[PDB]
Design a binder for these strands. Structure first.
Ligand code: MG
Ligand code: MG
Ligand code: MG
Ligand code: MG
Ligand code: MG
Ligand code: MG
Ligand code: MG
Ligand code: MG
Ligand code: MG
Ligand code: MG
Ligand code: MG
Ligand code: MG
Ligand code: MG
Ligand code: ZN
Lengths: 217, 152, 130, 108, 148, 291, 275, 166
RNA sequence: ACUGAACUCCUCACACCCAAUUGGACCAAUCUAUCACCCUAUAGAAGAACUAAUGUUAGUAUAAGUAACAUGAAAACAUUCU
């Protein structure tokens, strides 16, 4: 409706012509989704490209730093340290994590890790990304944490700070290779369908039905 | 002061109000329903009832003929009257119309009412239905009425 | 909230209520017609300076009258439907110069009154009076 | 004529806040059973009334496009017909008009 | 002004007069400047008189900040927590001495209108006046015009 | 003591409901579909044993919270404060309906229970009461009854007009107090444990358990007082606008046990009465109910 | 715009004052607020209250257990004042009793011990000690310091003064402060009683005298909304006390109170306390 | 200009303990630059203050004024806001704490009078503020009765004392 | 015989009640010079201080939500009618 209203109002405009380009730090979406089970050479070539662009790179040490980044990002959510949270999280992962939590605090502690975090696959981006490239890694994580969300007025919406609950996820990190200053940062989540639903909320809820414009149906 | 005056001053004169109600008549008699301000409709009701009672006589009466000729400016609803409405109310003697207040007009917040001849074709109105007989109090009423009928 | 009786019932029961209330009123009036069968208060003859209770009437209209002299006199009609007595007081209770009685006017709907007034009229036995 | 001293805030406030200048809450509202909206008891349901008015509007459109011009008012009764309906023996001679919709249960 | 200003009845803290008297000045805090023509009086006062004042009054405690201040202050905290600060800006030594001494002699409560210049917590002896003190009784306590 | 017995009954009913809603799981969820001409299509997420149709109407609008008396669960009445245990279809009922007979029966039951409670709390602490039950009667009966048996010393005595007025003002005070109907579903053995004393309530609970295949019974409490009721009941006493006792009658098998039956009449707020029709309804309810 | 910034400075001061009045921050300890020297404060407090004794005992009385607990807790992440408080409260009760039954031999053990318990009550001691400026001196974990904790610290100070200076000096101290605090609050204001008529009956039956009768001596406004009765309690045709009252019951119970005061010697017209 | 009313909702209280009073959720909402007058918008406001959301909506729906529809849509917006993004369980369990009107940035025009004289027309705009709170509405305080009159009078007579002496 | 003042006494301290006019001791805020630096000092200078001019400009009140203003009727909003 933007273009139609523009033409009908008379706000005709030329295309923005300028040598400058809008530079970003994280590609939108994902390149390859590891559809989990009910419970390769491509990744090898990906790791080869990773090493080529960045010789100083190890795999087996990656899960440790991944778990560390996860728990520290949650601690930064608790403390509201948005600057370092940005430095450690991508622009695609910041909104969905920090949009709804406004007008409310949060509590998240890391008890332990039942299973050690484990790399699943690795993908590398083609050169046709604004003349840049980005590398992605996927890691399964199985741990036990607590979650407690107080609203504006300090009353719990759900969750309990004392009782942890086993939890499994597939996290994805990504990094900018073209620049050297880019570091691995959380990008998205897969939320597979077969996984069960999380704990509901203590409060009851309704929905508004179809509003029958003054004509029965 | 006014004591016993049944009419009400309505427009810029007697001619104004009669022509006004005559236009309301010509509008009402064909649509067999009409919205309008409450006072206008209250006055319109009596004129409509008297007009149908005056037209019951039929078309042969030159009196009714010329009277309806005056009261109706479209000149096509007079046959409709004589050959539809009088047959419709041949059995009826009173209560030919129904008049009911409705929400106020948009801009002037005026008090408005809808009126329509009984036994129309188009859909009915959401009339105020009296309380149901199955209610507690109505059933108590039926109970002691039966008891009185049993007594006598 | 404020409501009225006519709304919370059915049209097949409304005429029942109407005729039943009318019959009750007529029965009360027929019963209180004769005060002699009921116990009356002591009667005394007229004395000098004494007074007599008044009453209430209903004005119907006017009409002419003619005298033996052929003279005309306009004259109003005053009609009396029920005109029952309602209450008596002692000149001590009243603390006035003279004792007082109460008289009613016209019988009207028992529905459009106050609860205390209806209680008074019931414990008295007669219908309401406006 | 003209004033002589400015009315103070206290007296202006008393005057313009006295109860008759205020609005009186009205305890004359209840819920409409079938539509599910509010209504004044002596007034009709605005929602149902607008529904009926729109229906009558389209019926008037239909009869007008049938008559095809002014001064075409017949001298007989008329009846509506909805989808899935047949003319009756009663309305055999009565005029009929067609409509493209389903019969509402509230309409006969 | 009395109606604009608050008021109080005359009273002392913890009944200071009955037992051992205690000067209810607790603490002093001086804010004076090394430089500043305004603080020269305070500097003279602290260099000569404050020694003897502290010697005479041990119960009081004195704090001196000696920081840059365009206007030198003196703050006095008393037993009740009553803080009162006053400017010694451009004041002579003798008036500073009188000021600190009146502070020492003051009590721990604001200066306001005193409703009464006295206070007796048990004013009545021989019994407080009631209407029946100065009138006799009746034989068998009979009200006027009473048979039995 | 009777007072101590009432407090013990209260404590045991509290323990029972506590066990119930502690046994029921936590953070449970159900989806109830609203039905009716008004606001159809809506579906409400509710708790399995803490939510109620009152909370439903509170989600919806205050009008239904104040105007509703019962609810139909899959075509079955319900207590507005009794929690719904499963996803189902739900409708609200009111006095202003086409078939309010069920709400009417519920009101009959509630008024009978109220009169029973007040008459059992009124009498001499040294006298005894062995109430039996609140019988069911049709709407045209003209009065809600309540059967009872009493001490033998006062068998000849009947309640006077001042006693009737005292009972009526007691009931008015109760309805001003505005206590809700604490409802619960308890076991047959539990009901027997609670009402073990009065053989009448014992054998009535036994009859109810024999009528019910699983023998599960329903209890209803008014603050301190409890009694069994066949059908659901009203949410808040305060809905009853006027309420009084008409007369008392005493039934021929009096020798083995006296059979007194009190009788009263009342009407709610949503449709109040006028003084006159109300007085004649009273002089009707003064009639002896043969049933 | 107007030049100059002296007025802007003055107005900033007024703005911050208004802001403090609107949303004032919570209070804090004078120990951590500036211009504080602990040892000098203790010494000057001693000189103020006119006593001279050991600073170590002073500090051990001022310190509490909660402060030590918090200190060692944060140190991970010395001597309490309990015995001194116990000694002080014990000697205080003993000496207060001594003085009180010396001044009023007629007062019974029950009433005198209730009175002493009141005078040692947390409210009066805490008020006196705040007026004495110990609250900030006391080391505590929670602020404002609890009244029971402050009472323990006060009685520990008392015990220290005893163990250092002497019992007679402790006696002068407690006498002055506590009885001066009591001067105003009268007997039935400090100590509560039920059925005072029954208490009086028991008392004078112990004293072996006739059981008195209550008789309205004077009356006014009996039918009036503000009844006033003067009731006298007469034994063997002799009056002990009269009492005014709204009603006859209030008048007779007040007369009982008056007679009890007269018998126990706590009349308002009694000999003042000798210092 | 001042717009603190919108920031009033930006506050976030700290977490509450289990054993403490459940805090009642407040909420603020306003409409800006309504073409209406203060002296009558305030009448509508004082009407709807001290009552519940549903009968407020009803009274405004059936009251025949222009500002009624404005306040109505404002209240509906406040309700749906509070339920969607303020953790309100029941949309109908709300009540008005205070609703007020305030002057706005107005405009001036010229009204022509006779004989060359002119007059200034100021078209008037009103900001409308409203505060909602969860829970049932508090009851209106009943009138103090004869017992209260007598009690306050007698405690006055007891509190009084002699003056200007010991 | 008493009551009865800013008179007089009484405890303390005192320059602290007249129009026009005249003589004197201080001082607010500002710029400059030199100090000082949570707002001050000593000197000079001056566009140097407003409860009032049917005072000027801008805003907002009272009068006042008052005086005053406006859209012919019905309806498919196509048309018709007065
Ligand atoms: Mg006109
Ligand atoms: Mg004098
Ligand atoms: Mg003099
Ligand atoms: Mg002098
Ligand atoms: Mg002069
Ligand atoms: Mg200066
Ligand atoms: Mg200068
Ligand atoms: Mg100038
Ligand atoms: Mg000025
Ligand atoms: Mg001027
Ligand atoms: Mg107007
Ligand atoms: Mg005027
Ligand atoms: Mg006008
Ligand atoms: Zn409807």
């Amino acid at each position: 409706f933007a273009m139609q209203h523009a033409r009908k109002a008379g706000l005709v405009i030329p295309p923005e012509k300028s040598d400058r380009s809008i530079h970003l730090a994280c590609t939108a979406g994902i390149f390859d989704a590891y559809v989990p089970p009910e419970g390769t050479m491509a990744s090898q070539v990906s790791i080869r490209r990773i090493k080529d662009y960045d010789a100083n790179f190890k795999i087996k040490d990656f899960p440790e730093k991944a778990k560390d980044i996860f728990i520290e990002a949650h601690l930064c959510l608790n403390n509201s340290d948005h600057d370092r949270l940005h430095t450690l999280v991508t622009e695609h992962c910041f909104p969905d994590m920090t949009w709804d939590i406004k007008y409310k605090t949060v509590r998240w502690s890391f008890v332990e890790s039942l299973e050690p975090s484990h790399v699943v696959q690795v993908r590398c981006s083609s050169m046709m990304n604004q003349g840049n490239v980005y590398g992605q890694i996927t890691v399964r994580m199985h741990t036990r944490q607590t979650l407690a969300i107080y609203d504006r007025f300090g009353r719990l919406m759900y969750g309990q700070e004392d009782v942890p609950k086993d939890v499994l996820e597939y996290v994805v990190f990504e990094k900018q290779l073209t620049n050297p200053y880019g570091s691995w940062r959380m990008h998205t989540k897969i939320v597979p369908p077969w996984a069960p639903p999380k704990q509901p909320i203590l409060k009851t809820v309704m929905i508004p039905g179809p509003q029958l414009k003054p004509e029965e149906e | 002061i006014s004591h016993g005056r049944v009419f009400r001053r309505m427009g810029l004169g007697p001619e104004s109000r009669i022509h006004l109600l005559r236009n309301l008549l010509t509008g009402l008699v064909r649509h067999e329903r009409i919205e309008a301000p409450w006072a206008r409709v209250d006055e319109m009701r009596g004129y409509a009832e008297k007009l149908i009672d005056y037209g019951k006589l039929g078309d042969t009466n030159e009196r009714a003929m010329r009277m309806a000729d005056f009261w109706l400016t479209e000149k096509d609803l007079i046959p409709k009257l004589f050959q539809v409405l009088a047959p419709r109310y041949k059995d009826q003697t009173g209560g030919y119309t129904r008049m009911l207040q409705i929400p106020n007009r948009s801009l002037d917040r005026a008090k408005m009412a809808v009126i329509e001849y009984k036994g129309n074709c188009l859909p009915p109105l959401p009339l105020p239905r009296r309380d149901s007989h199955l209610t507690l109090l109505n059933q108590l009423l039926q109970g002691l009425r039966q008891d009185l009928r049993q007594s006598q | 909230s404020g409501t009225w009786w006519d709304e919370h019932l059915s049209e097949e029961n409304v005429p029942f209520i109407k005729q039943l209330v009318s019959d009750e009123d007529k029965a009360q009036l027929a019963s209180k017609l004769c005060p002699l069968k009921d116990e009356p208060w002591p009667i005394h003859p007229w004395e000098p300076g004494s007074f007599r209770v008044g009453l209430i009437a209903l004005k119907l209209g006017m009409m002419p009258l003619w005298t033996k002299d052929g003279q005309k006199h306009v004259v109003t009609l005053l009609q009396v439907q029920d005109c029952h007595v309602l209450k008596y007081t002692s000149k001590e209770n009243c603390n006035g110069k003279m004792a007082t009685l109460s008289v009613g006017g016209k019988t009207v709907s028992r529905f459009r009154k106050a609860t205390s007034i209806l209680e008074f009229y019931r414990e008295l036995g007669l219908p309401p009076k406006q | 004529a003209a004033p002589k001293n400015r009315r103070t805030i206290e007296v202006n406030r008393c005057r313009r806040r006295n109860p008759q200048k205020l609005i009186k809450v009205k305890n004359n509202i209840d819920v409409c059973p079938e539509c599910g909206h509010l209504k004044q008891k002596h007034v009709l349901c605005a929602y149902c009334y607008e529904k009926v008015c729109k229906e009558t509007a389209e019926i008037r459109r239909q009869i007008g496009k049938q008559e095809g011009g002014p001064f075409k008012a017949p001298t007989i009764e008329t009846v509506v017909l909805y989808t899935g309906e047949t003319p009756s023996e009663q309305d055999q001679g009565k005029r009929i008009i067609e409509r493209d919709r389903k019969r509402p249960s509230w309409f006969t | 002004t009395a109606r604009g200003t608050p008021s109080r009845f005359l009273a002392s803290v913890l009944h200071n007069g009955l037992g051992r008297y205690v000067q209810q000045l607790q603490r002093l805090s001086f804010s004076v400047s090394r430089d500043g023509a305004s603080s020269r009086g305070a500097r003279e006062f602290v260099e000569r008189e404050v020694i003897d004042f502290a010697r005479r009054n041990p119960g009081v405690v004195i704090y001196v900040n000696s920081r840059p201040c365009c206007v030198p202050r003196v703050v006095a905290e008393y037993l009740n927590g009553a803080v009162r600060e006053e400017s010694i800006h451009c004041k002579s030594v003798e008036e500073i001495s009188t000021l600190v001494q009146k502070l020492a002699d003051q009590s721990g409560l604001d200066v306001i209108r005193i409703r009464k210049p006295f206070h007796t917590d048990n004013p009545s002896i021989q019994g407080q006046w009631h209407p029946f003190t100065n009138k006799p009784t009746t034989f068998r306590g009979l009200r006027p015009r009473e048979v039995q | 003591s009777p007072t101590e017995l009432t407090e013990m009954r209260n404590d045991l009913f509290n323990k029972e409901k506590a066990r119930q809603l502690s046994l029921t799981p936590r953070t449970e969820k159900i989806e109830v579909k609203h039905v009716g001409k008004t606001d159809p299509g809506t579906v409400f997420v509710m708790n399995k044993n803490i939510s109620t149709p009152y909370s439903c109407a509170m989600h919806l609008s205050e009008w239904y919270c104040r105007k509703s008396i019962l609810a139909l669960v899959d075509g079955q009445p319900w207590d507005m404060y009794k929690p719904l245990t499963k996803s189902c279809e739900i409708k609200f009922l009111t006095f202003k309906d086409c078939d309010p007979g069920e709400v009417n029966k519920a009101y009959w039951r509630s008024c009978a229970m109220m009169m029973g409670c007040v008459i059992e709390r009124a009498f001499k602490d040294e006298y005894m009461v062995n109430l039996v039950r609140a019988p069911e009667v049709p709407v045209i009966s003209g009065a809600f009854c309540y059967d009872v048996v009493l001490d033998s010393k006062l068998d000849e005595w009947m309640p006077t007009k001042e006693n009737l007025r005292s009972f009526t003002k007691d009931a008015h005070a109760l309805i001003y107090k505005d206590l809700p109907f604490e409802t619960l579903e308890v076991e047959a053995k539990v009901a027997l444990e609670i009402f073990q004393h009065s053989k009448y309530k014992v054998d009535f609970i036994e009859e109810k358990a024999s009528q019910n295949p699983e023998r599960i019974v329903k209890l209803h409490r008014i603050g301190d007082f409890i009694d069994v009721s066949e059908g659901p009941l009203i949410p808040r006493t305060s809905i009853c606008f006027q309420y009084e006792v008409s007369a008392v009658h005493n039934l021929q098998p009096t020798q083995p046990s006296l059979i007194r039956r009190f009788q009263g009449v009342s009407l709610p707020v949503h449709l109040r009465a006028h003084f006159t029709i109300w007085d004649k309804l009273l002089e009707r309810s003064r009639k002896m109910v043969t049933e | 715009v107007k030049k100059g910034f002296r007025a802007a400075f003055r107005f900033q001061k007024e703005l911050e004052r208004q802001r403090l009045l609107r949303c004032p921050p919570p209070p804090v300890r004078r120990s951590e607020k500036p211009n504080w020297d602990y040892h000098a404060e203790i010494q000057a407090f001693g000189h103020r209250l006119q006593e001279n004794f050991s600073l170590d005992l002073l500090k051990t009385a001022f310190v509490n257990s909660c402060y030590i607990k918090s200190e060692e807790a944060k140190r991970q992440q010395l001597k309490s004042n309990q015995e001194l408080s116990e000694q002080g409260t014990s000697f205080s009760q003993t000496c207060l009793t001594q003085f009180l039954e010396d001044e009023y031999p007629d007062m019974p053990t029950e009433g005198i011990k209730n009175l002493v318990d009141f005078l040692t009550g947390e409210e009066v001691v805490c008020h006196v000690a705040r007026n004495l400026a110990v609250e900030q001196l006391t080391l505590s974990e929670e602020f404002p310091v609890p009244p029971a904790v402050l009472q323990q610290t006060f009685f520990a100070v008392i015990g220290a003064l005893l163990q250092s200076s002497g019992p007679e000096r402790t006696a002068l101290f407690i006498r002055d402060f506590l009885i001066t605090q009591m001067t105003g609050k009268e007997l039935f204001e400090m100590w509560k009683i039920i059925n005072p008529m029954g208490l009086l009956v028991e008392e004078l039956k112990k004293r072996n005298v006739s059981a008195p009768e209550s008789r309205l001596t004077r009356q006014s406004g009996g039918t009036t909304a503000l009844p006033l009765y003067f009731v006298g309690l007469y034994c063997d045709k002799k009056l002990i006390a009269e009492g005014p009252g709204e009603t006859v019951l209030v008048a007779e119970e007040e007369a009982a109170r008056v007679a009890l005061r007269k018998l126990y010697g706590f009349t308002e017209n009694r000999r003042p306390w000798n210092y | 200009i001042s717009r603190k009313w919108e920031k009033k909702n930006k506050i976030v209280y700290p977490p509450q303990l289990p054993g403490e009073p459940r805090r009642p959720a407040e909420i603020y909402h306003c409409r800006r630059q309504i073409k209406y007058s203060k002296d009558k918008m305030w009448y509508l406001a004082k009407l709807i203050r001290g009552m519940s959301i549903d009968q407020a909506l009803a009274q405004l729906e059936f009251n025949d004024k222009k500002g009624a529809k404005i306040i109505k849509e404002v209240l509906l917006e406040a309700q749906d806001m509070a339920v969607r993004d303020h953790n309100v369980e029941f949309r109908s369990n709300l009540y008005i704490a205070e609703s007020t009107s305030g002057r706005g940035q107005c405009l001036k025009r010229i009204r022509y009078h006779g004989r060359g004289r002119f007059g200034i027309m100021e078209k008037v705009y009103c900001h409308y503020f409203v505060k909602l709170v969860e829970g049932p509405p508090p009851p209106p305080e009943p009138p103090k009765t004869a017992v209260a009159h007598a009690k306050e009078y007698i405690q006055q007579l007891r509190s009084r004392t002699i003056v200007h002496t010991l």
